Every structure is written in C-alpha cells, then in structure tokens.
Design a protein around this nucleic acid. Structure first.
Lengths: 97, 202, 155, 116, 127, 60, 82
RNA sequence: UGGGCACUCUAAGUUGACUGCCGGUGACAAACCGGAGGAAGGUGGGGAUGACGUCAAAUCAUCAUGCCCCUUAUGAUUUGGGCUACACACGUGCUACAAUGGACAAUACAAAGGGCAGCGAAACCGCGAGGUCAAGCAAAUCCCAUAAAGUUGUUCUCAGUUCGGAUUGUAGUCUGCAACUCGACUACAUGAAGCUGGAAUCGCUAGUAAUCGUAGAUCAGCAUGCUACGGUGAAUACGU
RNA sequence: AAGAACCUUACCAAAUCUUGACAUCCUCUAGAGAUAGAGGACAGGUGGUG
C-alpha cells in the first residue's frame, strides 16, 4: 500500500505527488497525504581545465526527490486503476504492496 | 577561459534535459546507449536539418523525439525513410519504436542550424565575413531580439588564427531569465579546422 | 580603517565575580579555542591571590590592573631620515586592552610550576608595583616622558 | 639495580624498570602482575623481598646483552647473504623502502652538502 | 501550561517548554550544571530570564538536539525568549532592547575553493 | 598508445586485479567516474548540453 | 606478507623445476623470472639465475637465505656514487 | 511505547526587506546620517555568473585537427624491471620540541554523506590488527558509526623526562596469482633529531585566525593530498 | 595524476609478431608468460609542430 516515487526533477515529483492521490480518490478510498521524503544530493567536483589549471573546479549536483503516498483503504477499483501511472518516462514508481 | 557555456548555465532553470529518464542502477549503460543512438543519428541524418535529439525511456522502450528543420526528409514519402531509421536503431540492443519528428519552421532562428549552415559554406571557400553577416541579417529579420556570431581560426586561409565576431540587437549572456540558443560547429578546411559559435536570443 | 569606525564585539559579565574585565582576561589566556582551561586558569588564580594577600580577589585585581594600564603611549610619525616618536595619550579603551595583555604576557614569561600560579604571582606583584607587567608601562611612560618635544606633531 | 643494569631510584617501578634495555612499558607492567609490587612504590622505598620477586621475573624475559646480541646477528645475517635489507644497512640507507630522494636523515646522518 | 518557544543556534534546535514553578533547568532531562560543562553557558542561557525578571520562575522542559554545548545553550536561550513572549506578549519592550528575539545567523563559513579551507590563503612564495 | 590500450582494457584480463576503468567516450584512463563511466572532461561537455539526466550545476 | 593460513608462496612452475632435478646429484643454473617466490627449504645447493630486469644473476642458495624471496638477492638498480 | 502528529524535522508552495516609512542634511536632484518596526536594513549574508582585450600564457598526452614523418615500426602481445633510484638544493604540508601537557580511567554534545552481491550489525575467538558465524537494509526503516576536542577525578613534578616517535630487530593481520624492489596496518623490543626556529616572509578585521574529529571521489588493497561536514573559538580595526 | 606489486605505463631489458592489438569491406601438454600443440586495399602511431 506504500506507493513511493523517485524523480530527478522536483517538478515531476510534485506532479507525481498529485495525480495519483486523485486516481486514488477516483474510487472510494482514503489515501495518505504526499509525504515529503529527504532528497538525495550527489555532488561532483571536477577540474574545469583540460590539463593543469587546478583550484578552478566546476561543481555539479544531481538531486533525487522522493515522495511517499499511502493508500489507507485499498479497494478493487484502485488496484485496477493503479496502472494509470502517468510517468513522464523519468519518475520511478515503487509500489510496495 | 572567459565565457560559461550558455546551455549548461541555464539547464534545469529555464532549459530542460535532452536525456529524460531515471535509472538508479545501470545508469552507465543506459546513458551510453543514449550517446550511441545520438552518434548514429548524427551521421545518418547529416544532410537533414536536425537540431535537437531527445531520448526518453519508459517500459523498456526508447522514445526518440528528433526536432528537424526538414520534415519529410527524415520521415520519407509517407514513412519509408523513418522506417529505415527505426529498424537500424532497432537492431541495437532493445526496441525503440517511438520516433517523433518535430518541424522546425524557422531554420534561421535555430543556433545549431545556423551554425551548421555557416560551417558548410565556410568549407566551400566562402567569405568568413559574408556568411556571418547574411545569417545575422536573416535572424534579425525573423524577429529575433538579438543574434551573435563568431568564426575563429585561420580566417580566409591565413597563417594566424583570428576571430571575427559580429552582433546585432540584444544578447544578454549574464541574465539567467532568458533563453539563448547556443551551438558550436566545426568546418574542416584544407588549412585546418574552424570554430563557429552562434548566440540566437528570442 | 579608512571608512569610519568599526563597532567592537562586547563581552558579558563574568559568571562568578560579575566583571566584563574578568571575562576578557579569559579570552587572552585561551589558546586554540579552549575556553575550559582559560576559565579554570583564572579561578585557580583569583582564589589563589586571596590566600596570598588576604583581600577580595576582585579587589586586588582591580588594584593591579590600574598599576598596569598605561597613561601615555608613543605613536610614530615621520618627517624623513628621522622618525618622529610622537607621544599620544592612551584612550581609556586601549588602556584595558594593554593592561590585560601585559598581565598575561609577563605571566607566561615567568615560571614556577604552572600557569595558574604564574598568573596569581603576577597579579599580586602588579598590585605591589613590581613585575614585568608594571615594568612595561614604566618604559611606556618613560618613552612618552623623553619625547615631549614631539608632542605637537600629533597629526 | 637489576642483574647489573642499575635503574633510576626515587622512581616508580613501572617507570624506572623501562630504563633497562630490552624492557619497555608494556613488558614492565607484566612484572608487577607476577611480582606483587603495587607499581607505585619508589625504587628507594622498595623492600628487598620485593626486589627478589622482581629479579626472578626479569631474567625470564630477554632482558640485557642477549637482546643486543640477537639484534646484531639478525642484521649480520642480512649482511652476509646480501639481501635488499642488509645491503642498504651497509650504505646507511632506509632499508624498509622509504624515499631516499630528499628526506632521509636518521639513516644518512649528517648533511654533508655539495655546493652548486 | 507549556509555553512553546522555539530557538535555533548554529546546528542546534531546542524545544523549550516553559512551565510554572521555581526549580532547576532540565536540559534533555538533566540538570543544566550537569549538562553544560561551563557556567558561562549557563549565564548566557539565563540572559532573557534576567533582562525581564523571571529568573527561575519556570522549569524549562527543553528537548535540544544538534550542535555542541554552546550552540545548544544559546538555542535554549533564544527559545526561552521566544517562549517568554508566549507566556506574556508584553515582554518584547526589553527583549528587543537587549537583542534576544533575533536568530543569530553567525553560522559557519563555506570551504572556499582556491583558498586554503576558509577565508584564509595558503603559503605564498616567489619563484 | 590509443586503439591498442583501449582494446586491451576492453579485452578481459586474466585476473581480477588487472582490469581498469577507461572513459568509454574518449578512452581516458584517469579520473573516470563510476556512476557515469565518464572522465572529468567528458562529464563536463555532456552535462553542459544536458545529455546526462538530472545533472545540473551546483550553486549551494 | 602472505599469512599463516596461506603459508609460503612459490611460483606454480618454479618448484616444478626444482623437484625435477633433486633426484640427480648436480645442481643447475635454471633461468628464473619469478622474483616473488619464497626460497624454500628444498632450495638448497642450487644456482638460481634470477632475472634482475636485464640479466640473470646467479645465486648459490645457502640455508640462511631460506625465508626471503630470491628477488631480495637480485639487485635491480645500480649505483656507483655521485 | 499504544496513540496522536501537537512541537521539531522533511519538501513543495507561499510571505517578508522594497530607502515602504519618520525625521534631518542635500530640494541641482540624486543621494547621505540617524530612528521605527521587523528574524533579517540599506547590493541581508554566501555561491554561480568573468566584457572589449592582455600574456604567440597552458593543453597536438582527454578529444579532434592543417601540415611533416614511421608504417615487418615511431606500430603490436607478453614476463621481469623502472616510474619510489640519492652527493644535495628548492616548494607545499604533517608531527612534535610538553605542565593551557603526557598518561590513566569513567562521562557527554553533531553535521554531511555512502551502501547490493555493498554497508555489513549481534555473538564468539584474538593483546591488537583482525578472523568465524551472522540479523537487517536497494535503505529518513538496517550498516558504516563511534565524533573527538570537551567534563570529572588520579598520577607524574620540568627532566631530552611518564615530552617526542623518527629509525631498526622480531612475530603477525588484511588485500590481492603474487607487498623483495615498492601497500596499508597490528603487537613486543629500540628510541633519533628535536629545549618553539636567524635574515627574510605570508594570512587574516567572526563564527573569521587558531584548534578537534567525521564523511566522500578515486579505489582489490593503498592520502599527512583534494573536496565537503560539523564542535570549541580572540580583538584592538583610534585612525590615513 | 580524484589512486605506479602485474595493469595503469605511454619508459627500459629479454620472448616475440607483421593485413597486424582494432577497424572497413573482402579440458590436457610444455613453455616466465605471451603463445604453441592437442580436448588486401588498409589499419595503427601517449610520434612532431599549442
């Protein structure tokens, strides 16, 4: 019942925070609010120069945003409508079930 | 080292990624598949006015959206040409049936198309000043707020590298709330390589 | 500096004796951010000078500080091949900074066993107009006494 | 004095006994476990019956002379068979494999400088 | 009757619960003189208790986590002032005069690239 | 030299301590990341166009 | 170095050309490339031409040398002063 | 821990700090000084952002590339060695020359990360490195993991010492086909120079200088290097 | 160079090879190991000139 989503972009995880609670309320079912889970920041530090010019570093990040939505009353119309995930090809879905 | 890359600076803020997919694991192989597709597209669709290539992945299926200034040249006479593109990509690893062709109506308003158009004329013994000025004139005529062009290295066949830079209008490369299309192209001549950079701001 | 004046960071009164002067003495004894030791150094010396002299720990300290604080400094001017040592009266705020500094420095330069006893020894000596701390101000006054001829070169 | 090597008096047993070659602090703490000495009594406050207990334990370990002789024949053997460690012993160079290019002074010895 | 006044200093957050009663200061269910190693921290902790006269009139049930002890002590102090107004909101007339309701932003510094760690620079010589 | 050491790295070596990592895009044997299998140079160029998902300039 | 469970190390081919000839009386000048093999107790009265990198320096193996690898007995670098 | 989700956190949206304001100096206007809220006041503090150009600055060894050469070699596969060699000089750091300390025992307070055939609990053995079995965790859930400086006591009593741990000897642990060249460590023995550094020199006006540990990238193994994270933490800065 | 026991190594000494280490179309046995036995236009060059 623990539907969790991981996304690189915070906008598609906010949209994924919604749009599935709405297909949960499409049937008669109570769903827990989108739980803001701590994002995971991966930081990379590389030398800008192609050779020797150190102390000039370009820093890059990659934030994996996370959400938790819990269905509290799983009805049959929710397990059939659980495939209506409108994933923009970049939002990972993990339904614990 | 003076100017930050305009695309890299604005990516995530106002620009969006080309490779739009998630991979907690197997990221290295999935990413290198993207470059493998893009590199194959680069030479196969060389004479087609291809500007951007977006690779999307969902349900073990690779979605490719190729923005081109010459639709029909990529698609074919109803789909024959795009079919060869799809199956040639199809032979590589998995299936990638989704290929979408997007028309680029204002070819002279795309940095990659303008830069490539400039670079191909430069290879055909053309004036390094006329190609810049004429291309700049077309974009400003098309409503662009400002265009900046630069051609570098052995201009006209000289023994010393130079850099002819011409600009018109407004091209603020310090403002972040502004979409400046930037692209770099190479023109391999008998005297060496050339460097073309275009800054089209709309 | 060039643009106006710089506000100074203030201290709170001492936990025990309720004196901002006492807390700043801790800030001088402290090395490498170690407050713990510096706090123990002073209280092991304030309570120690009470056994030597007999009077209040803060009362002897106030007497000693007065006998370290300098009244006339010597700032340097320049005309050319001769450097003008111009005597300048010390502003009240700098006097306390110099008096506290000379207490610590001339306690460190001495030695019996530890820092607490050295500090306590120097505190009592200062109230008796003896020690390096009071010998530093006697030389500071002396240089100001000698160079009164350069008084009117005070910028 | 233990077996010819006099230890500093007015010192604690655990501290004074390390003055003997071949005995360190960890070894010294071992004596006071066997010999019933509180590890805090000064050698000058020590009792003769405590000395006997200590001395009986000491010779059990490789205390003096023997350890000096042992360490020498070990290096002498390395000298005879001309290994990597042992040839560097002859030349006064770090035998473990440390960097001799710029920083080796406790083996090279005094800095006999060459002018430029 | 818990007057919840939050307080943050450096990397510490203190959940101050003012309750009526004359007693000790219980930091994380522990006496302030057993919790804070030094008394100088205990003086800075009772600064808003002294600026406006409420010394020891409350048993602060504080739940602090994060930082060291000085950061926790001033996070309690800041939380106490934000809780003294929770009891009587006519207390700011002296708290703003002594600057106790302001979150102190003197948090640490970034490790600046090109320079040795923080704002200082490494050794410099001439070739 | 290139095109021989790259093939050698691609070729499976005898032991598990002989293999090493090279930037698959360019062949650089130094400073190659594992999450992208790219060197610090190839990482910069590809991240500037936006061909590495989710990677953006850090400005904390 | 090694362990007690792993024990001593001799190259899988090296001892094979040692217990090859021990049933004979005469030792040989076997050319050697493995500098990492421990000099075993059965290595006794045997010249091992160990490769220093350019040459095969010979070494008559005595009892004392058992324990160290034959690489310790093959000087690789050369130095005649400064 | 049942239960709540109150507080705090977590992450999305959304307020606020704009010379709005109140005076007074300029009403040549901009501006400037003080004051009021207010968490924050004058670009609120930091980061990213580096114009024309300059130095034929650096990179043909990331890559590509005009030209010039090798092309049974200037190309190519293997084992060994070397890249770590040592008369010395230079740059950058680490460690100390102790008493604000050494040691000895108890006793606290973080942040930020990483992790699937990885992190690896708990138990057992070993002086210790470590090993044997192992639960859990694809992780705000389990593991790295314990911060240490810090506090409290005891012991030493200024000594090349109970400071210092360089260098050697012995016996071992892990990783790896393989630690000799040339790995990290662990025990026992040893115990160097070094008693705060000459002329010269650099850094810095706050959470800075100084000081203590933690994490990560690379990575079978290997950091006193680098990048990040917090804890304690000065003060005069009058003045030109 | 954000990782030299082999590798990395581009350097050296041996054992070697030449349409090649790579394009593009046309389980035992010695042996350090490579490798060996048995169950053709072209390539390439960390070569030079920043």
């Amino acid at each position: 019942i623990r539907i969790r989503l991981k996304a690189y972009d915070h906008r598609v995880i906010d949209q994924s925070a919604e749009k599935i609670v709405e297909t949960a309320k499409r049937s008669g079912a109570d769903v827990s609010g989108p739980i803001p889970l701590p994002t995971e920041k991966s930081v990379y530090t590389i030398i800008r120069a192609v050779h020797k010019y150190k102390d000039s570093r370009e820093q890059f990040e990659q934030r994996t945003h996370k959400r938790l939505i819990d269905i509290v009353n799983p009805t049959p119309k929710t397990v059939d409508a659980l495939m209506g995930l409108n994933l923009p090809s970049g939002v990972d879905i993990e339904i614990k079930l | 080292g003076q100017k930050i890359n305009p695309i890299g600076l604005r990516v995530g803020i106002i620009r969006d990624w080309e490779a739009k997919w998630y991979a907690e694991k197997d990221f290295a192989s999935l990413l290198h598949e993207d470059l493998k597709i893009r590199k194959f597209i680069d030479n196969e669709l060389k004479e087609a006015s291809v500007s951007h290539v977006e690779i999307e992945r969902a349900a073990n299926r690779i979605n490719i959206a190729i923005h081109t200034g010459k639709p029909g040249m990529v698609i074919g006479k109803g789909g024959s040409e795009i079919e060869k593109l799809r199956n040639k990509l199809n032979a590589l690893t998995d299936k990638k049936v989704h290929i979408n062709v997007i028309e680029i109506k204002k070819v002279d308003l795309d940095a990659r198309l303008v830069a490539e158009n400039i670079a191909r004329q430069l290879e055909n013994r053309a004036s390094f000043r006329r190609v810049q000025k004429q291309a700049i004139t077309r974009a400003m005529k098309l409503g662009a707020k400002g265009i900046k062009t630069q051609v570098s290295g052995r201009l006209g066949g000289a023994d010393i590298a130079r850099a002819e830079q011409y600009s018109e209008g407004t091209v603020p490369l310090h403002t972040l709330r502004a979409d400046i299309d930037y692209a770099h192209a190479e023109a391999d001549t008998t005297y060496g390589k050339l460097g073309v950079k275009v800054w089209i701001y709309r | 500096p060039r643009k106006g004046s710089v506000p100074k960071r203030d201290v709170l009164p001492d936990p025990i004796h309720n004196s901002k002067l006492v807390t700043k003495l801790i800030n001088k004894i402290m090395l490498d951010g170690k407050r713990g030791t510096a706090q123990r150094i002073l209280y092991s010396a304030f309570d120690l000078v009470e056994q030597r002299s007999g009077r209040d720990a803060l009362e002897v300290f106030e007497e000693a500080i007065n006998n370290i604080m300098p009244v006339l400094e010597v700032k340097a001017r320049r005309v050319g091949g001769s450097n003008y040592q111009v005597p300048v009266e010390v502003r009240p705020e700098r006097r306390t900074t110099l008096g506290l500094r000379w207490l610590v420095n001339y306690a460190r330069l001495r030695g019996e066993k530890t820092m607490e006893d050295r500090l306590a020894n120097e505190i009592l000596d200062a109230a008796n107009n003896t020690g390096g701390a009071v010998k530093k101000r006697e030389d500071t006054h002396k240089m100001a006494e000698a160079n009164k001829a350069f008084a009117h070169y005070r910028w | 004095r233990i077996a010819g090597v006099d230890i500093p008096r007015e010192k604690r047993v655990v501290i004074s006994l390390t003055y003997i070659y071949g005995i360190g602090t960890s070894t010294a703490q071992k004596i006071l476990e066997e010999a019933n000495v509180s590890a805090d009594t000064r050698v000058k406050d020590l009792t003769d019956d405590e000395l006997g207990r200590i001395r009986e334990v000491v010779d059990g370990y490789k205390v003096e002379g023997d350890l000096r002789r042992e360490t020498n024949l070990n290096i002498k053997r390395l000298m005879e068979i001309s290994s990597y460690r042992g040839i560097r012993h002859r030349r006064g160079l770090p035998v473990r494999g440390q960097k001799t290019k710029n920083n080796a002074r406790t083996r090279k010895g005094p800095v006999k400088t060459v002018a430029n | 009757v818990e007057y919840r006044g939050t307080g943050r200093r450096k990397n510490s957050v203190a959940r101050v619960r003012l309750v009526p009663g004359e007693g000790n200061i219980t930091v994380n269910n522990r006496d302030v003189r057993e919790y804070l190693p030094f008394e100088s921290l205990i003086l800075d902790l009772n600064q808003p208790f002294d600026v406006t006269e409420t010394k020891g009139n409350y048993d602060v049930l504080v739940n602090v986590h994060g930082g060291g002890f000085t950061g926790q002590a001033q996070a309690i102090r800041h939380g106490i002032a934000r809780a003294l107004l929770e009891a009587d909101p006519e207390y700011r007339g002296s708290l703003k005069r002594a600057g106790l309701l302001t979150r102190d932003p003197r948090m640490k510094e970034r490790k600046k690239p090109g320079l040795k760690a923080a704002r200082r620079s490494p050794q410099f010589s001439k070739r | 030299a290139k095109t021989s050491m790259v093939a050698k790295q691609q070729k499976k070596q005898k032991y598990a301590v002989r293999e090493y990592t090279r930037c698959e895009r360019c062949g650089r044997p130094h400073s190659v990341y594992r999450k992208f299998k790219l060197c610090r140079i190839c990482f910069r160029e590809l991240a500037y166009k936006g061909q590495i998902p989710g990677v953006r300039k850090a400005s904390w | 170095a090694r362990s007690i469970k792993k024990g001593p190390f001799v190259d899988e081919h090296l001892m094979k050309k040692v217990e090859a000839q021990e049933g004979s009386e005469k030792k040989q000048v076997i050319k050697t490339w493995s500098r990492r093999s421990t000099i075993f107790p059965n290595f006794i009265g045997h010249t091992f031409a160990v490769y220093d990198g350019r040459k095969h320096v010979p070494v008559y193996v005595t009892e004392d040398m058992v324990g160290h690898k034959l690489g310790e007995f093959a000087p690789t670098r050369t130095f005649k002063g400064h």
